[PDB]
Amino acid sequence: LDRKKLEQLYNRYKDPQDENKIGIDGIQQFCDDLALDPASISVLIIAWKFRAATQCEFSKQEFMDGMTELGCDSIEKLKAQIPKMEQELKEPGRFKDFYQFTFNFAKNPGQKGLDLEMAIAYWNLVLNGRFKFLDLWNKFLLEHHKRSIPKDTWNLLLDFSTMIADDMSNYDEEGAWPVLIDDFVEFARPQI
Ligand SMILES: CCC(=O)N[C@@H](Cc1nc2ccc(C(C)C)cc2s1)C(=O)N[C@H](CNC(=O)CCN1CCOCC1)C1CCCCC1
């Protein structure tokens, strides 16, 4: 890996007002160079591989360490990696890691939980086509005005989505389910 080539590539994205950070324009540019829409799951997958702390933020350390471990000193080398990252998420567990990372990436730094409509946005993206009851779930949350989602409720929603049946017949009340998922089963059962 040519470090000089990687340092100049970083210079293309860095904030004109802060050398140690990539700004909103630099994040947009990086997506454009990767031929990616900024609302694509592939942008979230890249954030996951670069292990970015929070959304709308990208540091020098994250970019440099990310590209080094991937062995990319160019955009074309990184674009060649995107189908390899998508393939790796076919593995449950790699997807569990990615899904759980999404909570920490989306929430505000300093805050322990994720705001409801922010969690719904990301659920719509990451649980797209892999949670039958997503429509009812969002409806239930927006209706019973739950302000924020706790880490364990977000995390156990994946366990719920992979274990639950179409009729919810295999759901166990005595199971280690958070009150929100448990209340959702009470609300949803008459509707299916
Ligand atoms: C789907 C991609 C994604 O998460 N996009 C984020 C913005 C990004 N931040 C980073 C940071 C680093 C990197 C590196 C390349 C690794 C990439 C990105 S893309 C977003 O707009 N996320 C929105 C929600 N956010 C918002 O609506 C704005 C949130 N505010 C911004 C100001 O500070 C407080 C939080 C999405 C839109 C798409 C569907 C899901 C909800």
Numbering used by the authors: 60 to 251
Text from the published report:
The neddylation cascade begins with the activation of NEDD8 by the NEDD8-activating enzyme (NAE), an E1 enzyme, followed by the transfer of the activated NEDD8 to one of two NEDD8-specific E2 enzymes, UBC12 and UBE2F. Neddylation of cullins results in the activation of CRLs. DCN1 was shown to interact through two separate domains with both UBC12 and cullin 1, enhancing cullin neddylation.
In the present study, we report the discovery through structure-based design and extensive medicinal chemistry optimization, of DI-591 as a high-affinity, cell-permeable, drug-like small-molecule inhibitor of the DCN1–UBC12 interaction. Comparison of the co-crystal structure of DI-591 complexed with DCN1 with the previously reported co-crystal structure of UBC12 complexed with DCN1 showed that while the majority of the amino acid residues of DCN1 interacting with the UBC12 peptide and DI-591 adopt very similar conformations, the F109 and F117 residues adopt significantly different conformations in these two structures. The bicyclic aromatic group of DI-591 is buried in a deep hydrophobic pocket defined by I86, F89, C90, F109, F117, A106, A111, and F164, and this deep penetration by the bicyclic ring in DI-519 induces conformational changes in F109 and F117 of DCN1 in order to provide more room for effective interactions with DI-591. Compared to the Met1 side chain in the UBC12 protein, the bicyclic ring of DI-591 makes more extensive hydrophobic contacts with this sub-pocket in DCN1. The additional methyl group of the propionyl group in DI-591 fits nicely in the small hydrophobic pocket formed by L103, L184, Y181, A106, and V102. In addition, this propionyl group forms hydrogen bonds with P97 and Y181 of DCN1 while the amide in the soluble portion of DI-591 forms a hydrogen bond with Q114 of DCN1. The cyclohexyl group of DI-591 is half buried in a hydrophobic pocket formed by M177, A180, Y181, and L184. This co-crystal structure provides a structural basis for the high binding affinity of DI-591 with DCN1.
